[PDB]
């Protein structure tokens, strides 16, 4: 147990991926490549298993910062997931993934209200889930 290489012990979500990166790519380049990867990329969160095409990464917020449930209920991202969905993050050190969801509030593409996702709980799908018609 003295000096050993850990087999990437992290999620499988974007944070899991975006992390794999911080191990390779630098800071600037990194954010670019990864953001992209997560971009147009659907991710099923472990919240309750929901797929969201992350198309934006709000490198401002984090699973610890507070947001108002897209509608106005202000909860620190972590709470939203861990306390309302039972997804204990603890890895609130990464940004957010404001995803383009299919929660169409009205048919006709142009998508609905985004999904400020947790890199740590958004299991990488690779589905792309084209979605909408915009």
Curated annotation (Swiss-Prot):
Q: What is the effect of changing residue 116 to Y?
A: Impairs binding to 2'-O-methylated 3'-end of piRNAs
- Highest taxon listed in the record's lineage: Eukaryota
Coiled coil regions in record: none
Q: Where is this region: Required for binding 2'-O-methylated 3'-end of piRNAs?
A: 51-53
Question: Any signal peptide, and if so, which residues?
Answer: none
PTM comment, free text: Arginine methylation by PRMT5 is required for the interaction with Tudor domain-containing protein (TDRD1, TDRKH/TDRD2, RNF17/TDRD4, TDRD6, TDRD7 and TDRD9) and subsequent localization to the meiotic nuage, also named P granule. Ubiquitinated by the anaphase promoting complex/cyclosome (APC/C) in late spermatids, leading to its degradation. Ubiquitination only takes place following piRNA-binding in adult testis. Ubiquitination and degradation in late spermatogenesis by APC/C is probably required to release RNF8 from the cytoplasm and promote histone to protamine exchange by RNF8.
Site description Required for binding 2'-O-methylated 3'-end of piRNAs, residues in chain: 116
Q: In which tissues is it expressed?
A: Expressed in spermatocytes and spermatids. Also detected in prostate cancer (at protein level). Detected in most fetal and adult tissues. Expressed in testes, specifically in germline cells; detected in spermatocytes and spermatids during spermatogenesis. Increased expression in testicular tumors originating from embryonic germ cells with retention of germ cells phenotype. No expression in testicular tumors of somatic origin, such as Sertoli cell and Leydig cell tumors. Overexpressed in gastric cancer cells.
Q: Which residues carry this modification: Omega-N-methylarginine?
A: 105
The record describes the protein's role as:
Endoribonuclease that plays a central role in postnatal germ cells by repressing transposable elements and preventing their mobilization, which is essential for the germline integrity. Acts via the piRNA metabolic process, which mediates the repression of transposable elements during meiosis by forming complexes composed of piRNAs and Piwi proteins and governs the methylation and subsequent repression of transposons.
How this chain assembles, per its entry, is:
Interacts (via Piwi domain) with DICER1, suggesting that it forms ribonucleoprotein RISC complexes; this interaction is regulated by HSP90AB1 activity. Interacts with MAEL, KIF17, PABPC1, PRMT5 and WDR77. Interacts (when methylated on arginine residues) with TDRD1, TDRKH/TDRD2, RNF17/TDRD4, TDRD6, TDRD7 and TDRD9. Interacts with CLOCK. Interacts with MOV10L1. Interacts with ANAPC10; interaction oly takes place following piRNA-binding. Interacts with RNF8; leading to sequester RNF8 in the cytoplasm. Interacts with TEX19.
Query: What is this protein's name?
Result: Piwi-like protein 1
Q: What is the lineage of its organism?
A: Eukaryota, Metazoa, Chordata, Craniata, Vertebrata
Q: Gene that codes for this?
A: PIWIL1
């Amino acid at each position: 147990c003295t000096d050993v290489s850990h087999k990437v012990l992290r999620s499988e979500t974007v944070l899991d991926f975006m992390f794999n990166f911080y191990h390779q790519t630098e800071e600037h380049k990194f954010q670019e490549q990864v953001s992209k990867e997560l971009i147009g990329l659907v991710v099923l969160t472990k919240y309750n298993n929901k797929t969201y095409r992350v198309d934006d990464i709000d490198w401002d917020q984090n699973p610890k910062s507070t947001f108002k449930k897209a509608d106005g209920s202000e909860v620190s991202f972590l709470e939203y997931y861990r306390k309302q969905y039972n997804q204990e993050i603890t890895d609130l050190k990464q940004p957010v993934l404001v995803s383009q969801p299919k929660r169409r509030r009205g048919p006709g593409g142009t998508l609905p209200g985004p999904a400020m996702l947790i890199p740590e709980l958004c299991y990488l799908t690779g589905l792309t889930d084209k979605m909408r018609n915009d």
